[PDB]
Tab-separated table of C-alpha atoms in Angstrom:
chain	number	residue	atom	x	y	z
A	1	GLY	CA	-175.035	-73.049	-14.719
A	2	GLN	CA	-172.699	-72.693	-17.687
A	3	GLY	CA	-170.115	-75.033	-19.191
A	4	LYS	CA	-170.978	-77.979	-21.409
A	5	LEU	CA	-173.677	-80.650	-21.495
A	6	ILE	CA	-173.035	-84.401	-21.452
A	7	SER	CA	-175.410	-87.150	-22.568
A	8	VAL	CA	-176.263	-90.250	-20.548
A	9	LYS	CA	-178.565	-92.831	-22.113
A	10	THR	CA	-180.065	-96.139	-21.034
A	11	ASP	CA	-182.962	-98.208	-22.361
A	12	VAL	CA	-185.490	-96.245	-20.285
A	13	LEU	CA	-183.814	-92.908	-19.569
A	14	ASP	CA	-182.392	-90.180	-21.813
A	15	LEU	CA	-180.553	-87.529	-19.805
A	16	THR	CA	-178.740	-84.271	-20.445
A	17	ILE	CA	-176.433	-83.311	-17.591
A	18	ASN	CA	-174.518	-80.056	-17.052
A	19	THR	CA	-170.962	-80.582	-15.793
A	20	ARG	CA	-171.143	-77.345	-13.774
A	21	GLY	CA	-172.762	-78.667	-10.594
A	22	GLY	CA	-173.966	-81.917	-12.125
A	23	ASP	CA	-177.548	-80.745	-12.490
A	24	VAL	CA	-179.938	-82.683	-14.748
A	25	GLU	CA	-181.346	-80.276	-17.339
A	26	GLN	CA	-183.158	-82.667	-19.683
A	27	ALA	CA	-184.788	-86.064	-19.213
A	28	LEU	CA	-186.593	-88.087	-21.869
A	29	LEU	CA	-188.502	-91.338	-21.402
A	30	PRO	CA	-187.926	-93.469	-24.559
A	31	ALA	CA	-190.346	-96.119	-23.282
A	32	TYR	CA	-193.236	-93.648	-23.343
A	33	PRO	CA	-194.646	-91.896	-26.444
A	34	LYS	CA	-194.974	-88.104	-26.185
A	35	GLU	CA	-198.522	-88.324	-27.511
A	36	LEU	CA	-200.710	-90.948	-29.162
A	37	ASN	CA	-199.726	-91.557	-32.803
A	38	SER	CA	-196.248	-90.192	-32.000
A	39	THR	CA	-192.749	-91.671	-32.388
A	40	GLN	CA	-191.300	-89.141	-29.971
A	41	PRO	CA	-190.188	-89.984	-26.430
A	42	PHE	CA	-191.874	-88.289	-23.463
A	43	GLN	CA	-189.938	-85.414	-21.940
A	44	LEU	CA	-190.083	-85.094	-18.181
A	45	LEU	CA	-187.371	-82.548	-17.570
A	46	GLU	CA	-187.057	-79.596	-19.936
A	47	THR	CA	-184.900	-76.487	-20.200
A	48	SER	CA	-186.553	-73.991	-22.505
A	49	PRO	CA	-187.209	-70.264	-22.924
A	50	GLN	CA	-190.843	-71.242	-22.246
A	51	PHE	CA	-190.584	-73.845	-19.477
A	52	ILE	CA	-188.118	-75.272	-16.959
A	53	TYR	CA	-188.012	-78.465	-14.881
A	54	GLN	CA	-184.670	-79.643	-13.513
A	55	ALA	CA	-183.168	-81.993	-10.941
A	56	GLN	CA	-180.280	-80.277	-9.169
A	57	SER	CA	-177.743	-81.682	-6.712
A	58	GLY	CA	-174.268	-81.165	-5.282
A	59	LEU	CA	-172.244	-80.628	-2.118
A	60	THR	CA	-173.235	-77.697	0.080
A	61	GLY	CA	-172.450	-76.920	3.711
A	62	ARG	CA	-169.546	-74.955	5.161
A	63	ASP	CA	-166.887	-76.533	2.939
A	64	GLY	CA	-169.073	-77.750	0.077
A	65	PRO	CA	-168.017	-76.432	-3.363
A	66	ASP	CA	-171.656	-75.957	-4.406
A	67	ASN	CA	-172.080	-73.525	-1.494
A	68	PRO	CA	-172.281	-70.010	-3.032
A	69	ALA	CA	-170.000	-68.752	-0.245
A	70	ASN	CA	-167.121	-70.917	-1.482
A	71	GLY	CA	-167.263	-69.375	-4.943
A	72	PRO	CA	-168.899	-70.350	-8.228
A	73	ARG	CA	-170.560	-73.727	-8.593
A	74	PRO	CA	-167.874	-76.401	-9.268
A	75	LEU	CA	-167.099	-77.282	-12.894
A	76	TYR	CA	-166.663	-81.061	-13.028
A	77	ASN	CA	-164.320	-82.767	-15.492
A	78	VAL	CA	-165.649	-85.567	-17.696
A	79	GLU	CA	-163.945	-88.064	-20.004
A	80	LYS	CA	-166.468	-87.871	-22.841
A	81	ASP	CA	-169.680	-86.170	-23.972
A	82	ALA	CA	-171.712	-89.301	-24.718
A	83	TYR	CA	-172.492	-92.245	-22.440
A	84	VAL	CA	-174.517	-95.221	-23.677
A	85	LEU	CA	-175.523	-98.405	-21.844
A	86	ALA	CA	-173.812	-101.452	-23.370
A	87	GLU	CA	-175.526	-104.622	-24.602
A	88	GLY	CA	-173.731	-106.812	-22.070
A	89	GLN	CA	-174.140	-104.470	-19.126
A	90	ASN	CA	-176.907	-103.904	-16.586
A	91	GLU	CA	-175.303	-100.762	-15.193
A	92	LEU	CA	-173.740	-97.525	-16.455
A	93	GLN	CA	-171.453	-95.297	-14.378
A	94	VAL	CA	-170.782	-91.647	-15.203
A	95	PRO	CA	-168.050	-90.322	-12.879
A	96	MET	CA	-167.149	-86.637	-12.963
A	97	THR	CA	-164.306	-85.237	-10.877
A	98	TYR	CA	-163.398	-81.831	-9.459
A	99	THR	CA	-160.273	-80.839	-7.525
A	100	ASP	CA	-160.009	-77.547	-5.646
A	101	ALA	CA	-157.083	-75.218	-5.002
A	102	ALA	CA	-156.148	-76.826	-1.685
A	103	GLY	CA	-155.859	-80.182	-3.449
A	104	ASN	CA	-159.011	-81.786	-2.046
A	105	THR	CA	-160.735	-84.121	-4.482
A	106	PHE	CA	-164.474	-84.061	-5.160
A	107	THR	CA	-165.854	-86.919	-7.241
A	108	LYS	CA	-169.452	-86.935	-8.465
A	109	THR	CA	-170.761	-90.129	-10.050
A	110	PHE	CA	-174.030	-90.859	-11.822
A	111	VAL	CA	-174.730	-94.592	-11.830
A	112	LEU	CA	-177.706	-95.789	-13.874
A	113	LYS	CA	-179.219	-99.252	-14.257
A	114	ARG	CA	-180.979	-101.027	-17.117
A	115	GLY	CA	-184.754	-100.652	-17.082
A	116	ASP	CA	-184.413	-98.550	-13.945
A	117	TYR	CA	-185.835	-95.044	-13.578
A	118	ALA	CA	-183.981	-94.604	-10.293
A	119	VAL	CA	-180.664	-92.835	-10.837
A	120	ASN	CA	-178.174	-92.946	-7.975
A	121	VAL	CA	-176.144	-89.781	-7.459
A	122	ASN	CA	-173.152	-90.597	-5.269
A	123	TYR	CA	-170.162	-88.582	-4.082
A	124	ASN	CA	-166.567	-89.236	-3.070
A	125	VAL	CA	-164.593	-86.645	-1.115
A	126	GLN	CA	-160.849	-86.944	-0.550
A	127	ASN	CA	-159.461	-84.522	2.029
A	128	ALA	CA	-155.917	-83.413	1.205
A	129	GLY	CA	-155.835	-80.482	3.620
A	130	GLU	CA	-154.829	-80.109	7.260
A	131	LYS	CA	-158.296	-79.280	8.592
A	132	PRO	CA	-161.492	-81.392	8.600
A	133	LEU	CA	-163.967	-80.730	5.785
A	134	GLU	CA	-167.588	-80.118	6.781
A	135	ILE	CA	-169.815	-81.185	3.893
A	136	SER	CA	-173.565	-81.601	3.445
A	137	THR	CA	-175.260	-83.049	0.362
A	138	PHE	CA	-178.414	-81.628	-1.193
A	139	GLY	CA	-180.986	-82.390	-3.872
A	140	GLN	CA	-183.382	-79.864	-5.365
A	141	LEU	CA	-186.220	-80.073	-7.876
A	142	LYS	CA	-187.221	-76.815	-9.555
A	143	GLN	CA	-190.015	-76.237	-12.076
A	144	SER	CA	-192.083	-73.449	-13.641
A	145	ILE	CA	-195.360	-72.960	-11.775
A	146	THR	CA	-197.473	-72.448	-14.897
A	147	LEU	CA	-197.405	-74.901	-17.815
A	148	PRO	CA	-196.791	-73.715	-21.400
A	149	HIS	CA	-208.289	-82.841	-12.673
A	150	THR	CA	-204.954	-84.233	-11.477
A	151	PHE	CA	-202.465	-82.602	-9.112
A	152	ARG	CA	-199.440	-80.704	-10.393
A	153	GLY	CA	-197.100	-79.585	-7.629
A	154	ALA	CA	-194.638	-80.896	-5.063
A	155	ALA	CA	-194.782	-83.633	-2.427
A	156	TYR	CA	-192.710	-84.990	0.447
A	157	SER	CA	-192.570	-87.680	3.129
A	158	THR	CA	-191.193	-87.844	6.667
A	159	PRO	CA	-191.313	-90.555	9.366
A	160	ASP	CA	-194.013	-88.469	11.068
A	161	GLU	CA	-195.703	-87.095	7.956
A	162	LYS	CA	-195.895	-90.340	5.965
A	163	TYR	CA	-197.320	-88.442	2.993
A	164	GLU	CA	-198.142	-84.790	2.352
A	165	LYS	CA	-198.765	-82.695	-0.764
A	166	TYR	CA	-197.595	-79.109	-1.264
A	167	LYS	CA	-199.215	-76.857	-3.869
A	168	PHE	CA	-197.138	-74.538	-6.057
A	169	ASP	CA	-199.610	-71.760	-5.269
A	170	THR	CA	-198.579	-71.933	-1.614
A	171	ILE	CA	-194.930	-71.650	-2.644
A	172	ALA	CA	-195.866	-68.817	-5.008
A	173	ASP	CA	-197.274	-66.857	-2.062
A	174	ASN	CA	-193.805	-67.045	-0.486
A	175	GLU	CA	-195.133	-69.274	2.288
A	176	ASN	CA	-192.553	-72.050	2.283
A	177	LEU	CA	-191.937	-75.400	3.969
A	178	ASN	CA	-189.198	-75.824	6.573
A	179	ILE	CA	-189.251	-79.197	8.321
A	180	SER	CA	-186.620	-81.732	9.366
A	181	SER	CA	-186.590	-85.535	9.507
A	182	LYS	CA	-184.516	-88.673	9.183
A	183	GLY	CA	-184.727	-90.450	5.855
A	184	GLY	CA	-187.769	-89.518	3.797
A	185	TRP	CA	-187.889	-87.877	0.374
A	186	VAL	CA	-189.120	-84.896	-1.643
A	187	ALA	CA	-190.806	-84.973	-5.043
A	188	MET	CA	-192.551	-83.062	-7.818
A	189	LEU	CA	-195.678	-84.654	-9.247
A	190	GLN	CA	-197.752	-84.735	-12.415
A	191	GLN	CA	-200.039	-87.228	-14.155
A	192	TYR	CA	-198.404	-90.643	-14.704
A	193	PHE	CA	-194.948	-89.253	-13.919
A	194	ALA	CA	-192.815	-87.922	-11.049
A	195	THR	CA	-189.328	-86.762	-10.014
A	196	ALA	CA	-187.993	-87.430	-6.526
A	197	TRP	CA	-184.872	-87.025	-4.403
A	198	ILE	CA	-184.142	-89.777	-1.885
A	199	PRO	CA	-181.246	-89.067	0.517
A	200	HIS	CA	-179.189	-91.929	1.924
A	201	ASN	CA	-177.485	-90.753	5.116
A	202	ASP	CA	-177.147	-91.017	8.896
A	203	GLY	CA	-178.395	-87.516	9.604
A	204	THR	CA	-181.472	-85.362	10.058
A	205	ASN	CA	-182.444	-84.115	6.609
A	206	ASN	CA	-183.959	-80.652	6.241
A	207	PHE	CA	-186.835	-80.370	3.770
A	208	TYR	CA	-187.858	-77.048	2.235
A	209	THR	CA	-189.732	-75.285	-0.548
A	210	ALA	CA	-188.643	-72.068	-2.243
A	211	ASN	CA	-189.904	-69.354	-4.552
A	212	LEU	CA	-186.924	-68.918	-6.869
A	213	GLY	CA	-188.548	-65.901	-8.503
A	214	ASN	CA	-190.037	-65.363	-11.960
A	215	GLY	CA	-192.772	-67.911	-11.281
A	216	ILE	CA	-190.321	-70.723	-10.568
A	217	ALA	CA	-191.153	-73.057	-7.680
A	218	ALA	CA	-188.733	-75.453	-6.001
A	219	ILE	CA	-188.559	-78.158	-3.343
A	220	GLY	CA	-185.488	-79.898	-1.940
A	221	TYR	CA	-183.485	-81.348	0.931
A	222	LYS	CA	-180.327	-80.448	2.851
A	223	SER	CA	-178.665	-83.303	4.728
A	224	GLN	CA	-176.935	-83.107	8.096
A	225	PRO	CA	-173.274	-82.087	7.541
A	226	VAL	CA	-170.555	-84.737	7.857
A	227	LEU	CA	-166.888	-84.385	8.779
A	228	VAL	CA	-164.092	-85.497	6.463
A	229	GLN	CA	-160.872	-85.719	8.476
A	230	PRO	CA	-157.479	-84.807	6.921
A	231	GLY	CA	-156.072	-87.505	4.641
A	232	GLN	CA	-159.311	-89.477	4.846
A	233	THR	CA	-162.016	-90.104	2.246
A	234	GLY	CA	-165.760	-89.562	2.662
A	235	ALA	CA	-168.867	-90.702	0.789
A	236	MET	CA	-172.357	-89.201	0.366
A	237	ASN	CA	-175.368	-90.730	-1.415
A	238	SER	CA	-178.790	-89.766	-2.813
A	239	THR	CA	-181.204	-91.319	-5.296
A	240	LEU	CA	-182.906	-89.392	-8.070
A	241	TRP	CA	-186.143	-90.853	-9.357
A	242	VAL	CA	-187.135	-89.634	-12.809
A	243	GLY	CA	-189.914	-91.323	-14.764
A	244	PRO	CA	-193.331	-93.041	-14.457
A	245	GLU	CA	-195.270	-93.428	-11.204
A	246	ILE	CA	-195.072	-97.226	-11.126
A	247	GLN	CA	-195.943	-98.359	-7.602
A	248	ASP	CA	-194.006	-101.642	-7.405
A	249	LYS	CA	-190.888	-99.965	-8.797
A	250	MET	CA	-191.054	-96.966	-6.456
A	251	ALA	CA	-191.547	-99.182	-3.406
A	252	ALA	CA	-188.022	-100.552	-3.828
A	253	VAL	CA	-186.363	-97.128	-3.902
A	254	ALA	CA	-187.932	-95.531	-0.831
A	255	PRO	CA	-190.947	-96.130	1.450
A	256	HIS	CA	-194.252	-94.329	0.760
A	257	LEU	CA	-192.948	-93.206	-2.645
A	258	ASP	CA	-195.709	-95.316	-4.209
A	259	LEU	CA	-198.293	-92.813	-2.886
A	260	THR	CA	-197.304	-90.239	-5.544
A	261	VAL	CA	-200.254	-91.481	-7.597
A	262	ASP	CA	-203.393	-89.346	-7.352
A	263	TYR	CA	-206.331	-91.622	-6.568
A	264	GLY	CA	-208.223	-88.749	-4.959
A	265	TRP	CA	-210.139	-88.840	-1.681
A	266	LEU	CA	-211.420	-92.204	-2.875
A	267	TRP	CA	-207.926	-93.641	-2.524
A	268	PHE	CA	-208.714	-96.718	-0.428
A	269	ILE	CA	-210.984	-98.083	-3.162
A	270	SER	CA	-208.726	-97.502	-6.169
A	271	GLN	CA	-205.431	-98.980	-4.938
A	272	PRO	CA	-206.779	-102.501	-4.365
A	273	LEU	CA	-208.662	-102.382	-7.678
A	274	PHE	CA	-205.456	-101.516	-9.520
A	275	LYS	CA	-203.625	-104.317	-7.731
A	276	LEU	CA	-206.694	-106.381	-8.584
A	277	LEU	CA	-206.652	-105.272	-12.225
A	278	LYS	CA	-202.891	-105.781	-12.501
A	279	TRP	CA	-203.300	-109.224	-10.936
A	280	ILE	CA	-205.670	-110.135	-13.760
A	281	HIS	CA	-203.420	-108.534	-16.386
A	282	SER	CA	-200.656	-110.891	-15.229
A	283	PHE	CA	-201.946	-113.832	-17.279
A	284	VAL	CA	-204.690	-112.319	-19.435
A	285	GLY	CA	-202.218	-110.207	-21.382
A	286	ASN	CA	-204.618	-107.327	-22.017
A	287	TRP	CA	-205.859	-104.341	-20.047
A	288	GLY	CA	-209.242	-104.081	-21.705
A	289	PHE	CA	-209.956	-107.753	-21.113
A	290	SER	CA	-208.666	-107.358	-17.537
A	291	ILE	CA	-211.179	-104.538	-17.066
A	292	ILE	CA	-214.002	-106.750	-18.377
A	293	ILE	CA	-212.998	-109.475	-15.930
A	294	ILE	CA	-212.698	-107.036	-13.017
A	295	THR	CA	-216.141	-105.758	-14.109
A	296	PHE	CA	-217.555	-109.273	-13.672
A	297	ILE	CA	-215.730	-109.747	-10.358
A	298	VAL	CA	-217.142	-106.516	-8.867
A	299	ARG	CA	-220.561	-107.641	-10.114
A	300	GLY	CA	-219.971	-111.046	-8.538
A	301	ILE	CA	-219.197	-109.698	-5.074
A	302	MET	CA	-222.123	-107.283	-5.387
A	303	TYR	CA	-224.760	-109.816	-6.458
A	304	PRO	CA	-226.375	-109.816	-3.008
A	305	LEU	CA	-226.682	-106.019	-3.109
A	306	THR	CA	-228.176	-105.842	-6.619
A	307	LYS	CA	-230.724	-108.556	-5.805
A	308	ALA	CA	-231.878	-106.959	-2.553
A	309	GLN	CA	-232.832	-103.617	-4.133
A	310	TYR	CA	-234.499	-105.521	-6.964
A	311	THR	CA	-236.561	-107.486	-4.451
A	312	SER	CA	-237.501	-104.109	-2.991
A	313	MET	CA	-238.314	-102.325	-6.227
A	314	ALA	CA	-240.257	-105.321	-7.565
A	315	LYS	CA	-242.299	-104.896	-4.401
A	316	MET	CA	-242.608	-101.173	-5.176
A	317	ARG	CA	-244.700	-101.923	-8.270
A	318	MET	CA	-246.871	-104.145	-6.067
A	319	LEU	CA	-247.509	-101.152	-3.816
A	320	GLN	CA	-248.159	-98.599	-6.561
A	321	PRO	CA	-251.916	-99.268	-6.622
A	322	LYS	CA	-252.372	-98.557	-2.905
A	323	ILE	CA	-250.434	-95.283	-3.093
A	324	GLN	CA	-252.699	-93.851	-5.786
A	325	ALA	CA	-255.523	-94.983	-3.517
A	326	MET	CA	-253.980	-92.813	-0.777
A	327	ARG	CA	-253.906	-89.890	-3.188
A	328	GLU	CA	-257.612	-90.496	-3.681
A	329	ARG	CA	-258.354	-91.078	0.013
A	330	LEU	CA	-256.470	-88.217	1.671
A	331	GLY	CA	-256.672	-85.892	-1.319
A	332	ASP	CA	-253.940	-83.424	-2.232
A	333	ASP	CA	-251.938	-83.025	0.991
A	334	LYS	CA	-248.235	-83.891	0.850
A	335	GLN	CA	-247.613	-84.251	4.609
A	336	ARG	CA	-250.068	-87.094	5.280
A	337	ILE	CA	-249.475	-88.903	1.956
A	338	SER	CA	-245.678	-88.696	1.832
A	339	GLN	CA	-245.318	-89.722	5.476
A	340	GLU	CA	-247.786	-92.617	5.266
A	341	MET	CA	-246.873	-93.857	1.798
A	342	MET	CA	-243.350	-93.734	3.260
A	343	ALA	CA	-244.696	-95.337	6.451
A	344	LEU	CA	-246.077	-98.172	4.308
A	345	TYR	CA	-242.737	-98.588	2.495
A	346	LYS	CA	-240.906	-98.580	5.824
A	347	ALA	CA	-243.542	-100.822	7.443
A	348	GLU	CA	-243.290	-103.468	4.736
A	349	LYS	CA	-239.544	-102.827	5.089
A	350	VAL	CA	-238.520	-103.572	1.513
A	351	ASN	CA	-238.345	-100.102	-0.105
A	352	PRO	CA	-235.435	-97.778	0.826
A	353	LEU	CA	-237.390	-94.983	-0.880
A	354	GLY	CA	-234.858	-95.092	-3.703
A	355	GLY	CA	-234.987	-96.099	-7.345
A	356	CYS	CA	-231.872	-93.991	-7.736
A	357	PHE	CA	-230.141	-96.085	-5.079
A	358	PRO	CA	-228.464	-97.970	-7.969
A	359	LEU	CA	-226.987	-94.590	-8.928
A	360	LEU	CA	-225.667	-93.401	-5.575
A	361	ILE	CA	-224.102	-96.793	-4.771
A	362	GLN	CA	-222.224	-96.522	-8.071
A	363	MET	CA	-220.943	-93.147	-6.908
A	364	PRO	CA	-217.848	-94.583	-5.221
A	365	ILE	CA	-217.322	-97.159	-7.991
A	366	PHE	CA	-217.418	-94.679	-10.894
A	367	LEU	CA	-215.111	-92.312	-9.032
A	368	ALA	CA	-212.689	-94.933	-7.719
A	369	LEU	CA	-212.309	-96.548	-11.147
A	370	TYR	CA	-212.161	-93.141	-12.829
A	371	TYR	CA	-209.279	-92.079	-10.602
A	372	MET	CA	-207.570	-95.418	-11.220
A	373	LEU	CA	-208.069	-95.009	-14.974
A	374	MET	CA	-206.824	-91.402	-14.955
A	375	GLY	CA	-204.061	-92.060	-12.433
A	376	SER	CA	-202.543	-95.428	-13.345
A	377	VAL	CA	-199.421	-95.274	-15.512
A	378	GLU	CA	-199.931	-98.849	-16.700
A	379	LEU	CA	-203.244	-97.889	-18.307
A	380	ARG	CA	-201.660	-94.946	-20.125
A	381	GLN	CA	-201.997	-95.661	-23.856
A	382	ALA	CA	-203.074	-99.186	-22.930
A	383	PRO	CA	-204.381	-101.249	-25.866
A	384	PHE	CA	-207.845	-102.749	-26.307
A	385	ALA	CA	-209.312	-104.596	-29.302
A	386	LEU	CA	-210.737	-102.898	-32.411
A	387	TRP	CA	-210.394	-99.118	-32.679
A	388	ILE	CA	-209.329	-98.488	-29.075
A	389	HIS	CA	-205.639	-97.656	-28.666
A	390	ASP	CA	-205.828	-95.622	-25.449
A	391	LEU	CA	-207.858	-96.861	-22.476
A	392	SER	CA	-207.034	-93.795	-20.383
A	393	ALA	CA	-208.509	-91.548	-23.073
A	394	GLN	CA	-212.030	-91.247	-24.477
A	395	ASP	CA	-213.176	-93.149	-27.567
A	396	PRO	CA	-211.956	-91.088	-30.562
A	397	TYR	CA	-214.948	-92.091	-32.704
A	398	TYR	CA	-217.280	-91.543	-29.745
A	399	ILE	CA	-218.833	-94.965	-30.454
A	400	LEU	CA	-218.571	-96.534	-26.980
A	401	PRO	CA	-220.703	-93.898	-25.240
A	402	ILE	CA	-223.376	-94.512	-27.883
A	403	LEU	CA	-222.811	-98.248	-27.348
A	404	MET	CA	-223.395	-97.674	-23.625
A	405	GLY	CA	-226.446	-95.567	-24.430
A	406	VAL	CA	-228.133	-98.218	-26.582
A	407	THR	CA	-227.552	-100.885	-23.909
A	408	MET	CA	-229.016	-98.345	-21.500
A	409	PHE	CA	-232.170	-97.659	-23.526
A	410	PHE	CA	-232.468	-101.437	-23.929
A	411	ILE	CA	-233.138	-101.772	-20.189
A	412	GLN	CA	-236.940	-101.917	-20.324
A	413	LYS	CA	-240.462	-88.100	-18.263
A	414	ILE	CA	-236.909	-87.266	-17.185
A	415	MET	CA	-236.115	-90.985	-17.288
A	416	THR	CA	-237.355	-91.057	-20.888
A	417	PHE	CA	-234.390	-88.876	-21.872
A	418	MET	CA	-231.586	-89.859	-19.506
A	419	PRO	CA	-230.187	-92.849	-21.423
A	420	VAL	CA	-229.002	-90.499	-24.211
A	421	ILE	CA	-227.842	-87.860	-21.705
A	422	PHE	CA	-225.364	-90.523	-20.578
A	423	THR	CA	-223.992	-90.680	-24.122
A	424	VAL	CA	-222.833	-87.055	-23.870
A	425	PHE	CA	-221.862	-87.495	-20.196
A	426	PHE	CA	-219.656	-90.398	-21.307
A	427	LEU	CA	-218.186	-88.575	-24.309
A	428	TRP	CA	-216.005	-86.771	-21.768
A	429	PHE	CA	-214.761	-89.886	-19.971
A	430	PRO	CA	-212.034	-92.530	-20.554
A	431	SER	CA	-212.948	-95.500	-22.772
A	432	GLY	CA	-211.920	-97.929	-20.047
A	433	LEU	CA	-214.608	-96.578	-17.729
A	434	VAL	CA	-217.231	-96.550	-20.502
A	435	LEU	CA	-216.174	-100.115	-21.318
A	436	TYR	CA	-216.698	-101.050	-17.660
A	437	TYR	CA	-220.252	-99.715	-17.686
A	438	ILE	CA	-221.229	-101.235	-21.027
A	439	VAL	CA	-220.122	-104.646	-19.771
A	440	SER	CA	-221.858	-103.962	-16.434
A	441	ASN	CA	-225.055	-103.015	-18.216
A	442	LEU	CA	-224.602	-106.134	-20.318
A	443	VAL	CA	-224.729	-108.088	-17.038
A	444	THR	CA	-228.230	-106.709	-16.409
A	445	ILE	CA	-229.191	-107.504	-20.010
A	446	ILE	CA	-227.777	-111.029	-19.602
A	447	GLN	CA	-229.757	-111.215	-16.330
A	448	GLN	CA	-232.880	-110.730	-18.443
C-alpha cells in the first residue's frame, strides 16, 4: 500500500496505520520494555527492509473496494495525522471515509479503548446506487517466516476445532489451510505476545493460510458476503487483538483465545498453577514471594508422597546388609541376585526400586513450572528482591544456581558430583524456577 501513515496512540497501544486499505503497519507496546534495562517500548508489528509483520483488513467480495478486481485498494480520507487518547476519555475513535465513483460511501473506523489491547475495526457502508452491494469483510495477518523453545507461527479456532496450531514451515511448503466455520478467530503467535483477528458476523467465516512469496507467511479470514440494498446502510465488524497474551483479558474478546499461551504438552498442569500463582500475587504484591508460597503449597499437598518414599528408602538402608549377604551367598550372578534382592524389596513392599523416584516425580513439576515461567506474560520482567529484576530470565550473576547447589550438597561416585552438575544445569534456566527449587530444597533442610 502507498499513501500516508496516520498515528493512533493510547496508554497501552502505539499504532501506525496506512490510509490505503487501513492496514496496521506498526504496533508498539508502551507498557512493555523492549529489553531489560531499556526505556524503549516493545514492537509487535514492524515494517522494515529486514522484517515485516502487519495486520491487514478491509472490504472484499464482489463489490468490496479492497477486492483487486474492483481496482486499486481504496485510499481512505482522514481528518488528521495524529490521534491521542484524552485524559477524560476511555475510548478513542479513528474514522476514515472513502466514497466511490457511483456515490456509495465506505466508512472505516478504528475504535480503541484505554488499557485495552483489543482494537475494534468496524465498517459502515451506505449504498447510493440502484443495485444491491455484495460485500464481505476480511482480516489478514502477514509476517516474515524467518526472524532477523517456544512456538512462532500461526493459530486458529473453530467451533469444531477449539484450538489448533499451524506452523509457518507448512505454509512455506505451499500446503495451506482452507476451512470454514461460524465465529472463531485466527492468530499469529510468539512468546508473551500475539495478534488475532476476531470476526463479528452472522455468516460462515472462511479461514485460510497463504504463502505470499519471498518467505512471507500469512493467515486470515473471509466472512460470508452480505447484501446492502439500494438507499440502505450496512455494518460489518471485526476485532483486532494486538499485544500481550494475558488470559483473563483475551477471554473477554473471544472464546478459546486464552489458549494462545504455550504451556507445552504439560498444559493441564501449568494453567492451574498460573491461576494459583496469580491468586497468591493478588494480595502478596510480588511474584517472587508468590512463587515461594506456591512452592510451600505444592510441598504441602505432596507431604504424603515425600514421606512414603522416605519410609521406603529408610527401610532400604535397613536391608543393605542382607543384600551384600546375597552377593556373598549366591556369588557373582546378576539374574538370581537382582531378582531376589528385588523380590525382597517387593516382598517387604516398601521399596519401589527407586532412589531416583524423587527425580522422576519432579519431571512433570519442573517442566510444568518451566513452561509457566517461560510462557506467562505476567512473569515477564517480573521483580524479585535483591539483584533479581527478571524472573523469566536466568540469574545474571549466576548466584542462584550456586545457591541451589550449596543447599543441594548440604543434603547429607556419580552422586558425589551431581550437586555441582545442577549448578551448570541451572545456569541455563529462569531464576524463578531456580528459586522454586532452592526453597523446595530448603524445605528438606528445614525438615532436618
